[PDB]
Design a protein around this ligand. Structure first.
Ligand code: HEC
Ligand code: ZN
Ligand code: ZN
Length: 107
């Protein structure tokens, strides 16, 4: 299950693995992937002005720390048909660290 990790390690993981396709700040632009502001507590496939796949919308997951960890373990396994071209974060340490950071960065 999800447990709070290191947000500093999380921020680096975000910069090096996620930032190329995602912004986190309020009003931040959409890039290859949607801006993630307010992602926790919002259903999947609902960021304003972003064109998602039917699969992402269909999943209809209410994003929380635990399901985000499961999704980030392997995105294509959790949401079959996703256009998010990312293999996943295989270490639970990395997922805990990234999510601790993301919970704050996207608030
Ligand atoms: C580009 C090559 C991407 C990288 C690198 C990462 N993400 Fe991604 N993500 C991307 C796209 C194109 C999409 C839309 C997928 C679709 O099928 O429509 C996404 C989506 C997400 C989501 C869900 C958004 C939502 O439901 O509103 C999340 C939570 C997400 N991406 C997180 C995320 C993180 C934390 C990553 C780094 C570890 C990451 N993404 C990398 C494209 C790309
Ligand atoms: Zn719901
Ligand atoms: Zn906010």
């Amino acid at each position: 299950e999800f447990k709070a990790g290191s947000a500093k390690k999380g921020a680096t993981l975000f910069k090096t693995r996620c930032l190329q396709c995602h912004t986190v700040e309020k009003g931040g632009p959409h890039k290859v992937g949607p801006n993630l502001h307010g992602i926790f507590g919002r259903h999947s496939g609902q960021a304003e002005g972003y064109s998602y796949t039917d699969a992402n919308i269909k999943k209809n997951v209410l994003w929380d720390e635990n399901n985000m960890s499961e999704y980030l373990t392997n995105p294509k396994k959790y949401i079959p048909g996703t256009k998010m071209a990312f293999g996943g974060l295989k270490k639970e340490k990395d997922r805990n660290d990234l999510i601790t950071y993301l919970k704050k960065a996207t608030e």
